[PDB]
Each structure stands twice: as structure tokens, then as C-alpha cells.
Amino acid sequence: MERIEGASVGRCAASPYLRPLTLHYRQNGAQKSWDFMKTHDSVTVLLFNSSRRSLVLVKQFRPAVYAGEVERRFPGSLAAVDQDGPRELQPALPGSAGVTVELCAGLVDQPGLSLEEVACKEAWEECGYHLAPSDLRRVATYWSGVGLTGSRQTMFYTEVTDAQRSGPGGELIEVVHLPLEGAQAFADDPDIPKTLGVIFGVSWFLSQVAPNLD
Amino acid sequence: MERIEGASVGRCAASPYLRPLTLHYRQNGAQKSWDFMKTHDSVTVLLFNSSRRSLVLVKQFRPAVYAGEVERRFPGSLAAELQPALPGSAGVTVELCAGLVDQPGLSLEEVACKEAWEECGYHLAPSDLRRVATYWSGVGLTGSRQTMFYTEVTDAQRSGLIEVVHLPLEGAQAFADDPDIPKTLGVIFGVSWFLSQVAPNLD
Ligand SMILES: CN1CCC(n2nc(-c3ccc4cc[nH]c4c3)c3c(N)ncnc32)CC1
Numbered sequence: 001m002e003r004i005e006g007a008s009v010g011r012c013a014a015s016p017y018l019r020p021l022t023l024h025y026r027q028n029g030a031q032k033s034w035d036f037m038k039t040h041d042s043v044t045v046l047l048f049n050s051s052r053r054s055l056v057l058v059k060q061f062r063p064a065v066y067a068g069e070v071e072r073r074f075p076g077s078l079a080a081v082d083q084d085g086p087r088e089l090q091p092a093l094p095g096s097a098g099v100t101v102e103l104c105a106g107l108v109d110q111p112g113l114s115l116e117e118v119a120c121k122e123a124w125e126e127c128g129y130h131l132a133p134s135d136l137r138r139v140a141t142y143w144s145g146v147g148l149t150g151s152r153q154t155m156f157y158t159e160v161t162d163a164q165r166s167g168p169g170g171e172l173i174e175v176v177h178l179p180l181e182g183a184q185a186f187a188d189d190p191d192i193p194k195t196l197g198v199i200f201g202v203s204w205f206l207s208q209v210a211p212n213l214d
Numbered sequence: 215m216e217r218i219e220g221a222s223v224g225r226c227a228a229s230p231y232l233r234p235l236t237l238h239y240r241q242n243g244a245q246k247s248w249d250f251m252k253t254h255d256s257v258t259v260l261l262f263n264s265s266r267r268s269l270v271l272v273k274q275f276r277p278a279v280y281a282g283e284v285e286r287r288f289p290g291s292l293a294a295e296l297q298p299a300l301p302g303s304a305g306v307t308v309e310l311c312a313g314l315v316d317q318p319g320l321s322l323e324e325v326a327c328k329e330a331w332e333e334c335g336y337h338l339a340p341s342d343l344r345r346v347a348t349y350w351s352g353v354g355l356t357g358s359r360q361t362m363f364y365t366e367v368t369d370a371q372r373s374g375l376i377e378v379v380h381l382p383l384e385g386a387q388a389f390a391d392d393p394d395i396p397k398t399l400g401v402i403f404g405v406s407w408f409l410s411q412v413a414p415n416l417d
Pocket residue numbers: 017039040042107247248249250353354355
């Protein structure tokens with residue numbers, strides 16, 4: 001997975017996910033405008049494999065994050081693309097720089113689907129776990145962009161057994177069974193690039209669900 | 215504050231907060247590309263006014279959120295000017311005290327005590343602040359880091375259009391949970407974390 005070659009940044013003109021806009025409005029009398037983007041809602045899922053006493057997460061490379069780490073470590077690298085085409089990434093960091101630990105997640109695009117379905121979908125696709133929309137329990141709903149994106153995200157949790165997990169042996173995204181003993185320590189450790197989701201999830205599970213179990 | 219007129223959605227060409235890009239790369243052999251934006255890092259602060267036994271938050275209108283709520287409630291509205299008519303109260307969010315990490319150099323703490331002064335009217339010293347967590351916010355389209363800090367306050371540091379919200383602790387939990395209030399995961403985590411971590415070891 002963690003093998004990325006020939007990173008090059010190019011200027012984006014059209015994109016389905018992008019679609020930036022400007023909102024003009026008179027606040028408290030004063031006429032203003034704001035720059036933001038039509039971006040997609042999303043759903044996240046926490047799995048607890050009761051049979052293994054582990055939590056289920058997705059470690060994967062994120063390009064956004066990778067390019068983010070390159071900008072910190074070599075500023076200006078993300079100078080505006082003004083060329084015949086893409087700029088090559090001059091100091092190119094290891095693939096392991098864009099690699100994040102996250103909750104199982106996905107966009108809310110498919111027209112109609114109850115969030116739960118979009119959840120059980122990602123839970124199948126990403127983790128290889130069969131889920132039923134009745135199994136899922138709403139944890140929280142909140143906004144992610146606020147600044148540049150008015151996107152909602154909804155979070156769900158459900159318990160699983162090895163009976164719902166089945167995968168063959170013939171790998172874009174890693175699956176991460178986090179054993180519960182180490183869960184807390186793991187969340188805290190700043191060496192691991194994670195989302196607040198991840199941190200909240202573990203934090204929440206341990207406080208809310210963990211005590212009322214075997 | 216919550217008074218917004220003449221909402222219209224408009225095509226953006228240039229922006230100080232935009233600069234989207236496409237990253238071309240060969241992963242595991244396979245050539246791919248991703249759409250994302252050069253965006254700034256950020257810092258957030260949780261204040262606990264010990265004197266009032268309240269937590270300190272910022273309620274403000276966010277245009278992004280407002281337009282987001284209009285799209286949920288009337289899809290396609292964001293087809294490629296348009297007048298929603300939805301109330302100003304639809305873009306109004308409760309958030310942690312927050313700011314960009316733009317000013318070149320500043321130790322995060324300073325950017326924190328800055329926003330804490332500017333937004334909440336609370337005097338803060340970088341020594342007061344306690345790192346809570348660091349994590350990524352965009353992941354999808356951004357890949358920006360955010361750092362979160364917490365510190366306790368007394369009415370003695372508070373003396374200084376965004377609202378300030380003293381959330382009393384009794385109601386804090388219920389408040390976080392309630393989906394009627396547009397909030398960030400920050401907000402949710404903050405309350406969640408404070409109650410579990412700090413609240414028990416106090417009077
Ligand atoms: C099976 N295919 C699905 C679409 C692919 N994809 N997915 C995203 C993406 C993923 C998550 C989020 C969250 C907010 N915006 C997002 C965008 C994305 C992007 N920004 N550009 C190009 N291709 C992208 C990945 C592989």
C-alpha cells in the first residue's frame with residue numbers, strides 16, 4: 001500500500017467533489033460574501049468485534065494528507081500550478097507520510113440511501129463486515145467544514161462477531177483491529193496520524209459502552 | 215447577529231481561502247490523482263470558567279453551513295444567484311474557540327490565547343494551556359492539522375459579531391447529544407473529554 005512514486009501536483013479546473021461557490025448576504029445590515037464549497041455529507045462507523053475484543057478502523061493513504069505533510073516539511077511546494085501541466089513533487093516524502101488511521105467512512109452520494117445503508121455499505125467494502133441497518137446506533141451528527149465546507153457527518157457504532165467478518169486471500173485500504181487494552185494509549189499517541197473521529201470514537205466507546213460488557 | 219438577507223449562491227473564480235489542487239501519483243504501481251485544497255492548520259480552545267461552572271464556546275453564523283442546510287432541505291438549489299429564504303438561524307453553529315495558523319511563526323498556544331482574547335474576551339497565558347489532542351481535519355479534501363487545547367478560567371480573566379456561550383455543566387452532556395444544535399465534533403469531543411477527564415477531579 002505505502003508505495004507512492006512520482007507525486008506531482010496539478011491545477012484542478014472541474015471536479016465533482018470540488019464545486020466552490022461564493023455566498024453573498026447582508027448580515028446585520030452589512031453586505032458580505034464568503035468562499036466555500038458544495039461538498040458531500042458523509043457517514044462513519046465504529047465496529048467492535050466482541051469475539052476478538054478489538055475495535056475496527058481503516059488505515060489508508062490519503063493524498064490530501066500526504067500533500068499537507070509535504071507543505072509543512074517543504075513550504076511553498078504547493079505554489080500555484082502555472083505551467084503546461086503538473087509540477088513534479090521536488091522533495092517527495094515517503095508514502096508513509098499520507099497514511100492515516102481513520103474510522104470506516106464514506107460519502108453520502110447514492111440518491112435515496114438511508115445513512116445506515118451507506119454505513120453497512122462501507123463496512124462491507126472497507127472492512128469486510130456484514131452489517132444490517134438495524135444493528136447500527138447513532139452516536140453523533142455534526143459539521144465538518146464550517147469554514148470552507150458546510151458538510152454534515154453522521155457517526156454510527158455497532159458490535160460485531162467474527163461471524164460477520166469474512167475475507168478471502170486474493171489491498172488498497174488496511175483494516176486495523178485495535179485491541180481494547182491498548183486502545184486508550186493508542187488514541188493518545190501523537191505518532192499516529194488520526195482523525196478526531198478516531199480519538200472521539202475510542203474515547204466515547206470506552207466511557208459509554210465498554211463498562212457495560214463482559 | 216442571526217439576521218441574514220438576500221442569500222444568493224455564486225460562482226467562485228479566485229479566493230484567499232480556496233486554492234484547490236490535483237495530486238498525481240503512482241500508488242502500488244497504479245497511476246491515480248486526487249482533488250484537494252491547500253488549506254491552513256488551525257487551533258481550538260476549551261475554556262472552563264470555574265467561577266460560573268460553565269464551559270466557553272462560540273456560536274456564530276457560518277455561510278458554508280447555512281448553504282449546506284439549504285441543500286439538504288431543498289436539494290439541487292446548488293445547481294450551477296438563487297434565494298433560499300431559510301432563516302439566518304440555519305447557518306448558526308456552536309463551536310470551540312478557534313483560529314487559523316497563518317501568522318508566520320506563532321507558537322500554537324499564542325494563536326490560541328489570541329482567539330481566546332478576540333473571540334471570548336478572556337485573557338490567557340500560553341503556560342495556562344494544556345494540549346488535548348492533535349489530528350487531521352480534512353482528510354478528504356483538505357489534509358490540515360488541528361491542535362486542541364484546554365485551560366481553566368475565572369471571571370477574573372473575562373472582562374473584554376460572534377456570540378459567547380457559557381454552557382452550564384449540568385446541561386453540558388445533554389446539550390452535546392442534542393442533534394437540534396449544529397456543532398463541530400470538536401464541541402462534542404470537548405464536552406465528552408472534559409466530563410470524563412477533568413470534571414471528576416474537581417469540587
Ligand atoms: C472508488 N473511488 C471513489 C471516488 C474516489 N475519490 N474519493 C474522493 C473523496 C473521498 C472522501 C471524501 C470526503 C470528502 N470529500 C471526499 C472525496 C475523491 C476526491 N476528492 N478526488 C478524486 N477521487 C476521489 C476514491 C475511489
